[PDB]
Amino acid sequence: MTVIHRMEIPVPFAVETVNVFLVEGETLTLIDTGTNTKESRLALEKQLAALGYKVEDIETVVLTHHHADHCGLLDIFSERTNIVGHPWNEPWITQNPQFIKRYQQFFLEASVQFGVPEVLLPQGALLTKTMIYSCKRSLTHTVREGDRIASLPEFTVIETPGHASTHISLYRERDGVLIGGDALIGHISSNPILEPPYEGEIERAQPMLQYNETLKRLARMNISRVLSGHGEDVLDVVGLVNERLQKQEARAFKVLNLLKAQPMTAFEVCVKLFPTLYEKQLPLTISENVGQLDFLAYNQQVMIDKSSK
Ligand SMILES: [Mg+2]
Ligand SMILES: [Mg+2]
Ligand SMILES: [Mg+2]
Ligand SMILES: [Mg+2]
Ligand SMILES: [Mg+2]
Ligand SMILES: [Mg+2]
Ligand SMILES: [Mg+2]
Ligand SMILES: [Mg+2]
Ligand SMILES: [Mg+2]
Ligand SMILES: [Mg+2]
Ligand SMILES: [Mg+2]
Ligand SMILES: [Mg+2]
Ligand SMILES: [Mg+2]
Ligand SMILES: [Mg+2]
Ligand SMILES: [Mg+2]
Ligand SMILES: [Mg+2]
Ligand SMILES: [Mg+2]
Ligand SMILES: [Mg+2]
Ligand SMILES: [Mg+2]
Ligand SMILES: [Mg+2]
Ligand SMILES: [Mg+2]
Ligand SMILES: [Mg+2]
Ligand SMILES: [Mg+2]
Ligand SMILES: [Mg+2]
Ligand SMILES: [Mg+2]
Ligand SMILES: [Mg+2]
Ligand SMILES: [Mg+2]
Ligand SMILES: [Mg+2]
Ligand SMILES: [Mg+2]
Ligand SMILES: [Mg+2]
Ligand SMILES: [Mg+2]
Ligand SMILES: [Mg+2]
Ligand SMILES: [Mg+2]
Ligand SMILES: [Mg+2]
Ligand SMILES: [Mg+2]
Ligand SMILES: [Mg+2]
Ligand SMILES: [Mg+2]
Ligand SMILES: [Mg+2]
Ligand SMILES: [Mg+2]
Ligand SMILES: [Mg+2]
Ligand SMILES: [Mg+2]
Ligand SMILES: [Mg+2]
Ligand SMILES: [Mg+2]
Ligand SMILES: [Mg+2]
Ligand SMILES: [Mg+2]
Ligand SMILES: [Mg+2]
Ligand SMILES: [Mg+2]
Ligand SMILES: [Mg+2]
Ligand SMILES: [Mg+2]
Ligand SMILES: [Mg+2]
Ligand SMILES: [Mg+2]
Ligand SMILES: [Mg+2]
Ligand SMILES: [Mg+2]
Ligand SMILES: [Mg+2]
Ligand SMILES: [Mg+2]
Ligand SMILES: [Mg+2]
Ligand SMILES: [Mg+2]
Ligand SMILES: [Mg+2]
Ligand SMILES: [Zn+2]
Ligand SMILES: [Zn+2]
C-alpha cells in the first residue's frame, strides 16, 4: 500500500532543513512544505520530479503546524488540493488582517515588556524581517484529536500542543510510526515558540507544562519511530523525553538561581542563559519564566513597563 518518502527542503533558518513527507497512497499526500522561498520551492520541485511527480499531482497537503518552514509553500498547490490541519492554523496561514494587526501589537508590546533593546529588534530587517516566509492560503479541512484524514487512512490525528498551539502529529497504530512534526526533535529541544493570544482567548495552557504533557503522552504511546520535522528519526521516545524533561528542570532551576542573585528583565535573563546565541537568534527564556511564575516559584515586579522578575 503506502510508500513514504522524506524530502529535505532547505530553509533560511538555523535548522537549515525541514523534513517533508510524501505519502504515495491511493492519492498523493504531502506532509509539510518548506518556507515561502524560491530555494524551498525549487528543491521541492526537483525532489518531486525525481520521484516522477509535479506539484500539481499532490491532492492533499497536511500541516503539522503553522510555522513558516511547514506551511510556507501552501500557495503553490493546485486549486483542487485539500489543505488539512489544526483549525487554529487558519488566521496564521491566511494572514488574516485583524490577526496580523494583533500579532504586530503583541510583539511590539512584548519587546517593551521583556526589555529588549530596540537595536536588537527586527526593526527594519535582519537579513530577514517577519511573516514573510509564510503563505497566504486557507485550510479546506480542519482536524482535531482522533480524526482521520481521507488520504491517510492508516493514521490518526493526535493533538501535540506545546511547540505551537496548532501542533498535531500523525500516528499509525499498525506499526507505531508517528509523523511527529516538531513535537520531538532528536538533536535539539523544540520548546514552546511564543505566540500572541488569539482573539477570544481568555487563556491557554501554560505552554511549557503543555509541551511537557505532550512529551509524556508520546512517551506512553507505543511509538516505534518518529519521523521528525527536523533531523534524524527518533527511535527511543521514552529516553529522549526523559532527557528533555531533565534538561528543562535543570534550566528552570538555573533561571530561578540567576534571579535569586540579581532580579532581572526577561532580556537580561536571556543574555545570561544564552551569552552567545542572543544576538544571532532569539528564544525561550520567557517560556521558563512563565513556567516558574505559574507554579508560584517566581514573582513579577510589574509596574515600570519592563517587567522585573
Ligand atoms: Mg487495507
Ligand atoms: Mg524517496
Ligand atoms: Mg525522497
Ligand atoms: Mg531525502
Ligand atoms: Mg532529500
Ligand atoms: Mg502514480
Ligand atoms: Mg497510481
Ligand atoms: Mg497505480
Ligand atoms: Mg532527488
Ligand atoms: Mg528526495
Ligand atoms: Mg535534490
Ligand atoms: Mg513541480
Ligand atoms: Mg516536479
Ligand atoms: Mg505542477
Ligand atoms: Mg509561494
Ligand atoms: Mg481531505
Ligand atoms: Mg496543524
Ligand atoms: Mg479562523
Ligand atoms: Mg482566521
Ligand atoms: Mg501566513
Ligand atoms: Mg485586530
Ligand atoms: Mg521583562
Ligand atoms: Mg532589559
Ligand atoms: Mg516583526
Ligand atoms: Mg515568516
Ligand atoms: Mg505570498
Ligand atoms: Mg491573496
Ligand atoms: Mg485561500
Ligand atoms: Mg473540516
Ligand atoms: Mg475523522
Ligand atoms: Mg489520517
Ligand atoms: Mg479528510
Ligand atoms: Mg482525499
Ligand atoms: Mg508558535
Ligand atoms: Mg501550544
Ligand atoms: Mg492509527
Ligand atoms: Mg494503535
Ligand atoms: Mg511536545
Ligand atoms: Mg525536541
Ligand atoms: Mg530529529
Ligand atoms: Mg524537547
Ligand atoms: Mg520563544
Ligand atoms: Mg509567534
Ligand atoms: Mg509562532
Ligand atoms: Mg484568531
Ligand atoms: Mg503561563
Ligand atoms: Mg500527559
Ligand atoms: Mg512511545
Ligand atoms: Mg494516548
Ligand atoms: Mg537529528
Ligand atoms: Mg533518520
Ligand atoms: Mg533515538
Ligand atoms: Mg535551586
Ligand atoms: Mg543580563
Ligand atoms: Mg549561548
Ligand atoms: Mg516561549
Ligand atoms: Mg496558576
Ligand atoms: Mg499581563
Ligand atoms: Zn516549528
Ligand atoms: Zn520546524
Side-chain angles (χ1 to χ4, degrees), residues 1-25 27-53 55-79 81-97 99 102-104 106-107 109-112 114-147 149-172 174-187 189-201 203-208 210-245 248-261 263-271 273-278 281-285 288-292 294-297 299-300 302 305-309:
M1 213 159 284
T2 61
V3 185
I4 306 183
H5 304 267
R6 179 180 155 171
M7 294 178 294
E8 295 179 7
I9 306 303
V11 297
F13 303 144
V15 75
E16 297 185 4
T17 65
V18 64
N19 297 325
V20 304
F21 297 87
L22 188 73
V23 182
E24 298 180 291
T27 63
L28 231 206
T29 302
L30 184 64
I31 299 131
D32 294 343
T33 72
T35 44
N36 193 355
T37 68
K38 301 160 192 181
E39 179 187 29
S40 298
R41 180 174 182 170
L42 285 174
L44 180 63
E45 292 175 337
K46 178 182 191 195
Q47 292 183 50
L48 282 172
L51 295 165
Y53 299 115
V55 166
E56 63 194 75
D57 296 323
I58 295 168
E59 169 270 353
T60 295
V61 175
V62 181
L63 300 183
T64 61
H65 64 301
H66 71 267
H67 292 170
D69 45 324
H70 303 262
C71 72
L73 288 175
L74 273 187
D75 307 315
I76 76 175
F77 299 96
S78 81
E79 284 309 310
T81 300
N82 304 300
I83 310 294
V84 185
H86 192 290
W88 253 348
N89 283 294
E90 189 75 349
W92 298 94
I93 66 170
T94 64
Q95 303 200 26
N96 174 268
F99 181 84
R102 288 169 64 83
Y103 178 95
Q104 290 164 354
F106 172 82
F107 279 97
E109 284 174 11
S111 58
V112 175
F114 303 154
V116 184
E118 294 90 314
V119 293
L120 276 6
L121 288 181
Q123 200 133 96
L126 241 327
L127 282 55
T128 161
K129 17 234 147 309
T130 27
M131 261 274 153
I132 53 182
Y133 289 123
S134 196
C135 60
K136 195 168 183 285
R137 178 127 176 200
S138 178
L139 296 175
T140 60
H141 302 265
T142 73
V143 284
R144 281 188 133 314
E145 181 75 43
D147 288 348
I149 298 167
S151 64
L152 297 177
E154 299 201 285
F155 286 87
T156 293
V157 172
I158 154 198
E159 290 175 35
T160 47
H163 176 76
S165 55
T166 55
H167 203 283
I168 67 178
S169 306
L170 304 177
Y171 181 65
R172 187 160 63 190
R174 175 174 53 72
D175 61 353
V177 164
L178 188 77
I179 304 175
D182 292 0
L184 189 54
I185 300 169
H187 61 288
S189 48
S190 34
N191 278 356
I193 305 306
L194 259 179
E195 295 178 7
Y198 289 93
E199 161 94 340
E201 180 175 37
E203 74 175 14
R204 49 166 158 71
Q206 205 307 297
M208 191 72 56
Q210 190 167 47
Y211 180 82
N212 294 344
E213 284 308 314
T214 287
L215 289 191
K216 290 171 184 186
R217 181 182 167 191
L218 293 176
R220 290 183 311 248
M221 291 183 59
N222 185 212
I223 294 164
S224 57
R225 175 184 185 193
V226 178
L227 310 179
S228 191
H230 305 279
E232 295 310 297
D233 297 349
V234 179
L235 303 186
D236 176 19
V237 169
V238 167
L240 187 51
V241 164
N242 285 337
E243 177 209 310
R244 293 295 165 66
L245 291 175
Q248 193 267 312
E249 181 157 56
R251 182 174 286 162
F253 277 115
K254 177 176 182 184
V255 172
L256 188 67
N257 282 107
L258 282 167
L259 287 180
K260 281 170 164 182
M264 285 182 278
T265 66
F267 174 74
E268 286 181 305
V269 179
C270 183
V271 174
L273 282 175
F274 306 109
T276 55
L277 300 165
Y278 77 87
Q281 296 155 252
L282 32 88
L284 228 231
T285 304
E288 296 290 334
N289 285 305
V290 168
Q292 299 197 305
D294 195 284
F295 262 12
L296 272 306
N299 343 352
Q300 11 254 243
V302 189
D305 259 318
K306 301 84 201 20
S307 302
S308 180
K309 288 94 197 307

